[PDB]
Design a protein around this nucleic acid. Structure first.
Ligand code: MG
Ligand code: MG
Ligand code: MG
Ligand code: MG
Ligand code: MG
Ligand code: MG
Ligand code: MG
Ligand code: MG
Ligand code: MG
Ligand code: MG
Ligand code: MG
Ligand code: MG
Ligand code: MG
Ligand code: MG
Ligand code: MG
Ligand code: MG
Ligand code: MG
Ligand code: MG
Ligand code: MG
Ligand code: MG
Ligand code: MG
Ligand code: MG
Ligand code: MG
Ligand code: MG
Ligand code: MG
Ligand code: MG
Ligand code: MG
Ligand code: MG
Ligand code: MG
Ligand code: MG
Ligand code: MG
Ligand code: MG
Ligand code: MG
Ligand code: MG
Ligand code: MG
Ligand code: MG
Ligand code: MG
Ligand code: MG
Ligand code: MG
Ligand code: MG
Ligand code: MG
Ligand code: MG
Ligand code: MG
Ligand code: MG
Ligand code: MG
Ligand code: MG
Ligand code: MG
Ligand code: MG
Ligand code: MG
Ligand code: MG
Ligand code: MG
Ligand code: MG
Ligand code: MG
Ligand code: MG
Ligand code: MG
Ligand code: MG
Ligand code: MG
Ligand code: MG
Ligand code: MG
Ligand code: MG
Ligand code: MG
Ligand code: MG
Ligand code: MG
Ligand code: MG
Ligand code: MG
Ligand code: MG
Ligand code: MG
Ligand code: MG
Ligand code: MG
Ligand code: MG
Ligand code: MG
Ligand code: MG
Ligand code: MG
Ligand code: MG
Ligand code: MG
Ligand code: MG
Ligand code: MG
Ligand code: MG
Ligand code: MG
Ligand code: MG
Ligand code: MG
Ligand code: MG
Ligand code: MG
Ligand code: MG
Ligand code: MG
Ligand code: MG
Ligand code: MG
Ligand code: MG
Ligand code: MG
Ligand code: MG
Ligand code: MG
Ligand code: MG
Ligand code: MG
Ligand code: MG
Ligand code: MG
Ligand code: MG
Ligand code: MG
Ligand code: MG
Ligand code: MG
Ligand code: MG
Ligand code: MG
Ligand code: MG
Ligand code: MG
Ligand code: MG
Ligand code: MG
Ligand code: MG
Ligand code: MG
Ligand code: MG
Ligand code: MG
Ligand code: MG
Ligand code: MG
Ligand code: MG
Ligand code: MG
Ligand code: MG
Ligand code: MG
Ligand code: MG
Ligand code: MG
Ligand code: MG
Ligand code: MG
Ligand code: MG
Ligand code: MG
Ligand code: MG
Ligand code: MG
Ligand code: MG
Ligand code: MG
Ligand code: MG
Ligand code: MG
Ligand code: MG
Ligand code: MG
Ligand code: MG
Ligand code: MG
Ligand code: MG
Ligand code: MG
Ligand code: MG
Ligand code: MG
Ligand code: MG
Ligand code: MG
Lengths: 67, 96
RNA sequence: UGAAUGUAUAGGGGUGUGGGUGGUAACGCGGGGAAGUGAAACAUCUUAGUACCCGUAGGAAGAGAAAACAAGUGUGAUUCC
RNA sequence: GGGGCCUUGUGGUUCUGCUGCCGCAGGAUUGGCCAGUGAGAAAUGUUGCGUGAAGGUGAAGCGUCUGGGAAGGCGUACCGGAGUGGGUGAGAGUCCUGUAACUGUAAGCGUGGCACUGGUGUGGGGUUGCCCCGAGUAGCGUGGGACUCGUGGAAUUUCGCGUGAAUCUGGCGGGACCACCCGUCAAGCCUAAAUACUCCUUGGUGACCGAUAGUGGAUGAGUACCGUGAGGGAAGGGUGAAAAGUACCCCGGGAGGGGAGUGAAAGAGUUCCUGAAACCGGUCGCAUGCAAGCCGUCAGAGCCUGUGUGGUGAUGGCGUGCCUUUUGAAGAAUGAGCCUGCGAGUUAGUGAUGCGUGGCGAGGUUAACCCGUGGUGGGGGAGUCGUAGCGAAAGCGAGUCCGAUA
RNA sequence: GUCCGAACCCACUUCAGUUGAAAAUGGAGGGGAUGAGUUGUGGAUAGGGGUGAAAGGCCAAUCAAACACCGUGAUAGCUGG
RNA sequence: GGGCUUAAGUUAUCCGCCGAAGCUGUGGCAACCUGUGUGGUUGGGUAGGGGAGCGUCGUGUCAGUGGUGAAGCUGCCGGGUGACUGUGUGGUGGAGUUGAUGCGAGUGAGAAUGCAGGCAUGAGUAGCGUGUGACGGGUGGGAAUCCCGUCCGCCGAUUAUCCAAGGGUUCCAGGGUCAAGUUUGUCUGCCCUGGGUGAGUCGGGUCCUAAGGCGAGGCCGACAGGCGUAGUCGAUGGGUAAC
RNA sequence: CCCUAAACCGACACUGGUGGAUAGGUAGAGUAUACCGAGGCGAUCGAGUGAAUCGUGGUGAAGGAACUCGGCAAAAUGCCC
RNA sequence: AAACGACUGUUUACCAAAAACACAGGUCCGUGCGAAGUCGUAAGACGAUGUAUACGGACUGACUCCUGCCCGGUGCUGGAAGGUUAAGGGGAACUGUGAGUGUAUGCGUAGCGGUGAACUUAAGCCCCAGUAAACGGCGGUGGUAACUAUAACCAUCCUAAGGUAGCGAAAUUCCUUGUCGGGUAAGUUCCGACCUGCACGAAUGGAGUAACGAUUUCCCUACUGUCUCCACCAUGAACUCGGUGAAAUUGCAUUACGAGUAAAGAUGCUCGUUACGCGCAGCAGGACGGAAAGACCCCGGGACCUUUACUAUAGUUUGGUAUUGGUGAUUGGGACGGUUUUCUGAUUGUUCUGGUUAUCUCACUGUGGACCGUGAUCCGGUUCAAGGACAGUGCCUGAUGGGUAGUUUGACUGGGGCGGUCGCCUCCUAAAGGGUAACGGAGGCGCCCAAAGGUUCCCUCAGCCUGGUUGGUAAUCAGGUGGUGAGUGUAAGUGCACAAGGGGGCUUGACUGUGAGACUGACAGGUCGAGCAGGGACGAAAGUCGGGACUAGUGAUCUGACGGUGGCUUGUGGAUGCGCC
C-alpha cells in the first residue's frame, strides 16, 4: 500500500530547492490593530524550520514536495 | 506532539491556489546547447535536444545562462529575453 | 355454473396443461445495516457500506452500443489490468 | 432520422386478385451477390478429425567379493526420443512398476468443426407541403443517499413526498446560471470475449509440515467427551526383510521369569525402531553422629585409585540465590516444584527515508502485458525520478518574489 | 387465610462440616401445616427483554443486563514476557 | 569481641612494617592513534548505539563420505578468547550425511500465576462416605470381607412390596479376576459367551377433547415475518370388554 | 430389570433430591414414639488401644446467670381428667 | 413492660426473614367503551365475552379519634385580551445573462434563471384561574409576669404561609451517661416524666390501640456445668498394627538463639552464645505461613443508575400539503372598463385569488345491523344506518419527549476530597553574569491617553523659616534656604534634576516599502535595531520622530466576515466562486 502524505503538512510547509523546509509566519491572521508595523513585518514572511521540526515535516510529507 | 498543538496545526496554511491548466516547459540553457551542438550547430529542433536530453513530448523553452559563442537557429516553444539576445548576438535566431 | 344481484364478479365443480417447493463451499446482483476501534476523551467523521442479515441468480453475474468524453484538431459500446 | 410524395431497381417464372385492363401484393421444383443454429425479429437430419473416460506396445547385465540380504566394492558389457520418480532384504537406466515415443478408443448426452439436405431472406438519388420520433417522463421544490465533494458556488446520479414540461425553429450534457459553440438524442429491449471463484474430478509441483508439527482430525474425528440447547471438542503413528509373533521343558493360580528356538539382531517379543532428562533404585570408593552450612570458591591433609590421572575430601579463609522491577531487593516486593518438548521483532508493498554494495550514467528504470507451453530469457519506455528555480498565480527565468523596471 | 401437632412445605437459632457425606448440607431444636397451602404432568412469557407479595431478586450451580457463536488476533498511555 | 590502665587509652614526636583488582615487575590478548623500523594511549559498565562471530535446519555447486556402520544418544582424552569444539578414541545405534563457498530461515528459552506430557515434595501422611456382628463348615493357590448354616442384632408409614418418570440389558445361566469396586475378593449392578420380555380385555395408538401449538384460504407487515378462520394436533383429564 | 435408589437427577457404588399405590400387632389420640409382623437387612477396609485433643451423648456436691455483647447452649416445663 | 408492624402470609436459591414487601381498608387521578392502560411496525390481542357499585395508575395501609396553614415554585386541569413564534401562502424590491442600443464606456427588451420574503399563518411559551390524600413549603430581631429561666403578649422585617392537634433525650437528641423519679448493693441499657425538638408532626400520614410476632429491648420467677471450677463415664476420629492411598504447597537447603545491621521487623549478613545423628506424638510464636494479580485508598478504563449536563430519538402533539370532492354566503388583494373625482375621498357588475363559515355525498371510515361466499364471531362482497371531505394515513413542519440511546463531567495537590491556583508583569528567595523550585514571601495586569504621542523652546521641585485680608498646619503673594527627601497616568524595580518631572508654540512618524547586525526561547515565538527611498511634523540649523522613561494591558491555527486589488475561472464571454494584501 502506498503511504499517504499528511494533508495539513501538504498545506502548510514548502520545501526549497536546496532542501530547506519553510512555513508561513504565524500570528498575523487577526488582532492586528495593536500589533505595530514592526511586529506585523516580523510576522509577514517565511520561516526556515529547525532541524527536528524539519525532519518531522519531511516524515509527515510522503515524498510530497510541499506546496 | 504530546498534546501541545503540533507544528502542522500551529503554522498558518499557505493559501493560494493551483492553476488547473498550467503547463511546464522543459528548459534548456545556452551552455547545454553549446556543449551538445558545438560544431557550428546550424538548426536545433525539439527532436535534436530530445535526442540529447530534453525529455520529449513537452514544451522546450530555452533559457540564457551561458555565453554561446557558436551560431545556432533554435526553433522551439518560447525563450527568455536574455537567451534571445545572446542567440541573436552570436549570429543565430529563434522561431516558433 | 355464477351468489348477495342487475351486468357480472367472488366463489363452486371437472382436467393434470405446464411451472414451483428443498439443498448448495466460493464467486455475482439488488436491498437492510452495526459496534468494538481510531480520533490518545467524544458527538461530526472513521471503522465501513466492513461483520451480519434479506431477496435472488449464473456458469459466470453485473455493465454494455453515447441524452458519452474531449476542447477546438479529435476519440468513438461495455468490462478488466 | 424515418413516414408520406417520386426518379428508379429485385434475382427467370406457371398466371390470381386490388388500384386507373398503368402499377402493387400472396402465389411457384429451378439462381443467390448473401446469411444461419448465433444477441441478431427463428428453430428441425446424414456425412467429415483428434481425443479425455480403459486400454495396447514399450529398450537394455552378467561375473565375482563381503554381507542375513547387493541396488554396495571390484571387473567387464549394453539401452537411451527412455538417466523424472517410486518399489525390490542396503544406495538400480538395464529386477519390478514404470518412463520417452507411438498407439487404440466400441462407446459416450460424446465434444468441436466442415460439406450437403432441410430452414429464412436486398436498395440508391430528390423532396419538408405535411406526419411520427418512448409523459406523470424530464425538470422544479423539499427531506435523505452516492459522487474527490461532510450543503455548498452543487453541476452529475438516485429514493420518499409534492409540483410538473418541450417535443426538432425541440430535448439533454460540457461543475451554479445564461448566451453562443461543441457533443449528443433520456424516459423500450437483448448482447460473446477479456474479469471473479473452487464444494468437486484428473495429472503435477514445493531452500511447505513431519505426529506438541501439518487440517480439529495420519487411528471409531467432528468421534470419545462436555453441554438442556445453540455449541464446544480431544489424545492415541513406527517389531521385523519376512510373523519366521517364541514349538517344547522348569518355578508360578496367574502375571512374570529362566532354559531353548526363529531371526542378521529378541536388551527388535507385540507397553516391540532409536530410547535423552527429570524421577526411582542395587553395588562399589571416599566422607559423614561437638556440628550453625545461598551449600560454592580458594588453600588443603588423609584415604581409595593410579587406567602415575582421577574420585572423595577432615580442616582454614572468603562468601546474603535467579529474574522482574526499583532511589534501593539476599530480601520478609513479583514469578518460578522439576525435567523434556513447544512459546515473542515477521511478511507484503514497481510505500517513506538513510546506509553498504553492484549495474548504467546526463541519464536510470520499466508497470500491465506479449513471446518462450522450455525456466530464471527476450521484448514492452505507457509512466516515473533526474535534467532550474522563484512566485498564490498569471508568469518570468539563473534568476524570481515583496517592491516603485527602486 | 382458627389452635396443637406428624406426613408435606420452609429455613429462625445453635453445633458440626469447611481439601465436606454435600459447589449450601447433617444433628438438635424451630415456622406454616384447609390455605394468599403444597405437589405431579404438559404448556406460555426471552435478554435492554421476561418475570418479580419488590431482595436488583430469579431467568439451567457467579445476572446493575443470561448463554453460544461471530465482528475478533476488540482496545488497554497499564502489568507481565 | 576477648581483653586492656603493668595501655592494648588520649596526646606530641621519631623509627619500622602491614595493607587494594591502585602503582611497579613478568607473561599473553584486544581497540584506536601515530611517525609508519619507536611505539604511545586505551580496554568496569545498566538503558542504549556501533562492529564481528558460534551453533541449528533447508538449499545451489564442487569434493566427497556411509552396513568395513550415517544420524541421534552416551563416555573418556584433548582444543579455542567466547558462543563452542576434535579430522582423537570407545559404547549404543541401524541409514544417512561431512568439508568449502554462497542462498534462505518457523535459527538458539530460565522465567510470561506461559501451554502439553512425564515425574517429584508433602507422605507411606489425611481419608476409606450414619451402623453390629459372632461362630461352625465349604470352596479355593490365596478368605474378616464369596457360599451354606446356627446364634445375635437392625429397619418395619419402611432398610418391605409394586408402579410412573428417567435409565437401557444393568435381568438369568455359565466362564473370568487385567481394569472398576475407596481394602481383599474365589465375589459383583464389572468382563466375555449364550439366553430371557408372549395381551381382543392391563398402559398408550387405532376414540375424544383442555391449556397450548400449527394453520387451506385470509388479514397485517419494506423483505424477513406476525396473527388468525375453516380445520388438525395436543393428556396431566373423559370413554372403552377378565378374573 | 432398577425404581422413598449402588441402575434416575447430583462428575462417584455420593449421609442430598425424586411423583403415586399397599401399609399388620401391642402400648398410644395418632401414619408421633417404643418394641415387633409381612418382608428385608448386618451397610461395600479391618484389628486393637482406658494418651492428649476435637466431635456426640451422660452424670454431678454447694451455689444458682456470679457467665456472656446477649441466659448462646442446656436444664426446667411438658400428657389426659 | 416498652418499640415497630394491625393480623395470616412474602422476600435477598448460596452471609440479612426483618421494623422491609403484601394485605384488607382509605383517598386522589384517569377511563363513556375500537374505553383508558399495556404488548406489537401493524393487524390484532389482554383489559373483558367486563361497562363508572367497572377497569387502570398513584400514594397510604386493620381498627379508633383525626388529618391543621400555604397555589408563591414545579406539575396537572381549564382559559385565551395581548406579546413571541415553523413549515406553508404570498408581496414589493433587487439581480445574472441577453437580441440590440450605444463614436466607446456602459445600458438593456424577450426568454431562461437567482436572492432573501412587508403581510398572513398553529400548537407551544409568556399570561390569567383552579388544584396539595399533587411534587412541595410550613420563618427572623428587640423586649416584657413582684426571685430568677422562658415567653402567653407587643412592635417590626420578610414570605405563598410561617408547624395546628397530638407527640417528644424518640428506630429521630450532637452536646449526652441531659435532669428528676423507679427498678439494683451498684444500671452509659430499661421504664415514667420534663422541654432546652442540633435536626418530630398529621395519608412519604399524626397520636393511640385488643390480638398476633423464630422481630428488637428491659425486668421478675423457675431452671440449670453458662459460670465459681471443673471432674468422671462411653463413643466417631486422633494413637498402634495389616490393606489401600490423596491434597493444597514447593527458588534452594546440613533451614538455632541474643544484640545489632540492612528496602528501616533476618534460619541465610556482623559480633557473640548455644548446639551429638535420626525419629514419634503434640501446640501454634515465626517462616511478614497457605488460599484469592486487595474488595479499603489513589490512578487509568468500564458498566449500570439519575437529572432543569450535552446531543439525539421512539412515542405524543401543531399546522401545511396529498389522498380530497359538489354546492352558498361573509369578509380582502387584484386585473378589468367607467358611476366617481390618474386622485386625498367610494364603487357596482365583469374574471383570478387568500381567510372566516354553512350544507351535500357509491372519496374515505376496516364500525353497528342484515344478506351472500358458507352449515365459519376470521376475511371479503352487496346493502342499510352513522359519520364525512373531517378523521386516518404518507411527506414536510414547530413543540414536547431520561421513555430510550451514545457520551462528557480538567489538572496541580506533602494520599484523595474541600479550599486555593492555572496566562502576563515587578521585587525577594536566587548563593555580585544569565537561569533556578515549593499549596515560599510581597504586589500588580486583561488598561488608559488625540494628548498623557512627535518636535522645538523655556522652567525647577517637596520640605523648612519669616512677613502678609478673609486664610487656619495646609488655597494665593513676597524674601531666604533647600539639590533631590517632590514628581513620574497605573504595581514594583531600574532610571530620570543634563531631566524622562512642570509649562508654551506648531503638529500626526500612533507613517508606506524595508531591515545590515544582534539578544532571547526545544520550537511556535518574543525583542532591539543601523542605514536607504517615498511622502510628512517640528527646528534657524544640527538633527529628532515607524506611539507613550522602560518592562504588563494579551490569544496560534482552523472557520467565517468586511474593504481594496484583479492573479485564477473546467469549451468560449460574462457571472459566480476562489486567491492575494
Ligand atoms: Mg487576511
Ligand atoms: Mg497593520
Ligand atoms: Mg490542551
Ligand atoms: Mg453508522
Ligand atoms: Mg460510535
Ligand atoms: Mg478515540
Ligand atoms: Mg486510547
Ligand atoms: Mg444453472
Ligand atoms: Mg449479462
Ligand atoms: Mg519394459
Ligand atoms: Mg553387483
Ligand atoms: Mg460523502
Ligand atoms: Mg440535482
Ligand atoms: Mg440535468
Ligand atoms: Mg462550462
Ligand atoms: Mg428516443
Ligand atoms: Mg442488458
Ligand atoms: Mg480452474
Ligand atoms: Mg504425542
Ligand atoms: Mg495433531
Ligand atoms: Mg518422535
Ligand atoms: Mg448429551
Ligand atoms: Mg518358533
Ligand atoms: Mg539395545
Ligand atoms: Mg523402544
Ligand atoms: Mg565430628
Ligand atoms: Mg557465627
Ligand atoms: Mg533504573
Ligand atoms: Mg519503593
Ligand atoms: Mg522471594
Ligand atoms: Mg526468603
Ligand atoms: Mg507488579
Ligand atoms: Mg509462587
Ligand atoms: Mg513518455
Ligand atoms: Mg391455620
Ligand atoms: Mg399458628
Ligand atoms: Mg423462601
Ligand atoms: Mg416450553
Ligand atoms: Mg438497594
Ligand atoms: Mg443461577
Ligand atoms: Mg454484570
Ligand atoms: Mg450493555
Ligand atoms: Mg473491527
Ligand atoms: Mg591496573
Ligand atoms: Mg568495556
Ligand atoms: Mg547495553
Ligand atoms: Mg564406500
Ligand atoms: Mg539431519
Ligand atoms: Mg555449508
Ligand atoms: Mg523459535
Ligand atoms: Mg526449556
Ligand atoms: Mg515454566
Ligand atoms: Mg512420594
Ligand atoms: Mg506409619
Ligand atoms: Mg505429617
Ligand atoms: Mg498422624
Ligand atoms: Mg487415619
Ligand atoms: Mg450369612
Ligand atoms: Mg428393633
Ligand atoms: Mg424397558
Ligand atoms: Mg451381557
Ligand atoms: Mg454394562
Ligand atoms: Mg446379574
Ligand atoms: Mg455370574
Ligand atoms: Mg481391589
Ligand atoms: Mg465370579
Ligand atoms: Mg384448541
Ligand atoms: Mg397461507
Ligand atoms: Mg389426539
Ligand atoms: Mg392419561
Ligand atoms: Mg444414594
Ligand atoms: Mg426400594
Ligand atoms: Mg448417578
Ligand atoms: Mg417433595
Ligand atoms: Mg402402626
Ligand atoms: Mg415411626
Ligand atoms: Mg419376615
Ligand atoms: Mg431391599
Ligand atoms: Mg462403613
Ligand atoms: Mg462391614
Ligand atoms: Mg462404597
Ligand atoms: Mg449417680
Ligand atoms: Mg450442680
Ligand atoms: Mg443438687
Ligand atoms: Mg433458686
Ligand atoms: Mg452479669
Ligand atoms: Mg442480672
Ligand atoms: Mg463479667
Ligand atoms: Mg435456648
Ligand atoms: Mg431442653
Ligand atoms: Mg428506646
Ligand atoms: Mg410511646
Ligand atoms: Mg408483621
Ligand atoms: Mg408470620
Ligand atoms: Mg440468604
Ligand atoms: Mg437466614
Ligand atoms: Mg385496596
Ligand atoms: Mg387505546
Ligand atoms: Mg378482547
Ligand atoms: Mg397522587
Ligand atoms: Mg408505607
Ligand atoms: Mg404507618
Ligand atoms: Mg397560539
Ligand atoms: Mg384549598
Ligand atoms: Mg445518644
Ligand atoms: Mg439517659
Ligand atoms: Mg436515674
Ligand atoms: Mg396535610
Ligand atoms: Mg417524616
Ligand atoms: Mg404527607
Ligand atoms: Mg403497640
Ligand atoms: Mg495404616
Ligand atoms: Mg537498622
Ligand atoms: Mg535478631
Ligand atoms: Mg553463609
Ligand atoms: Mg514433630
Ligand atoms: Mg492444629
Ligand atoms: Mg499470605
Ligand atoms: Mg492488584
Ligand atoms: Mg463513564
Ligand atoms: Mg395533524
Ligand atoms: Mg350516508
Ligand atoms: Mg442517559
Ligand atoms: Mg463509543
Ligand atoms: Mg488527581
Ligand atoms: Mg492532601
Ligand atoms: Mg543573578
Ligand atoms: Mg551566581
Ligand atoms: Mg528545576
Ligand atoms: Mg496605532
Ligand atoms: Mg538581520
Ligand atoms: Mg515581554
Ligand atoms: Mg525622509
Ligand atoms: Mg511624555
Ligand atoms: Mg480545528
Ligand atoms: Mg470540462
Ligand atoms: Mg504592505
Amino acid at each position: 500500500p502506498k503511504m499517504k502524505s499528511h494533508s495539513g503538512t501538504k498545506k502548510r510547509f514548502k520545501v526549497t530547492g536546496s532542501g530547506k523546509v519553510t512555513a508561513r509566519k504565524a500570528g498575523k491572521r487577526h488582532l492586528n490593530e495593536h500589533k505595530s508595523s514592526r511586529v506585523t513585518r516580523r510576522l509577514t514572511g517565511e520561516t526556515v524550520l529547525s532541524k527536528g521540526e524539519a525532519a518531522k515535516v519531511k516524515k509527515l510529507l510522503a515524498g510530497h514536495p510541499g506546496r | 506532539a504530546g498534546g501541545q498543538m503540533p507544528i502542522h496545526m500551529q503554522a498558518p496554511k499557505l493559501g493560494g491556489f493551483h492553476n488547473p491548466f498550467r503547463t511546464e516547459y522543459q528548459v534548456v540553457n545556452l551552455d547545454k546547447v553549446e556543449a551538445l551542438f558545438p560544431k557550428g550547430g546550424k538548426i536545433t529542433v525539439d527532436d535534436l535536444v530530445s535526442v540529447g536530453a530534453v525529455r520529449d513530448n513537452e514544451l522546450v523553452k530555452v533559457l540564457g545562462t551561458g555565453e554561446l559563442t557558436v551560431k545556432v537557429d533554435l526553433v522551439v516553444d518560447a525563450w527568455s529575453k536574455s537567451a534571445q539576445e545572446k542567440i541573436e548576438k552570436a549570429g543565430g535566431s529563434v522561431t516558433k
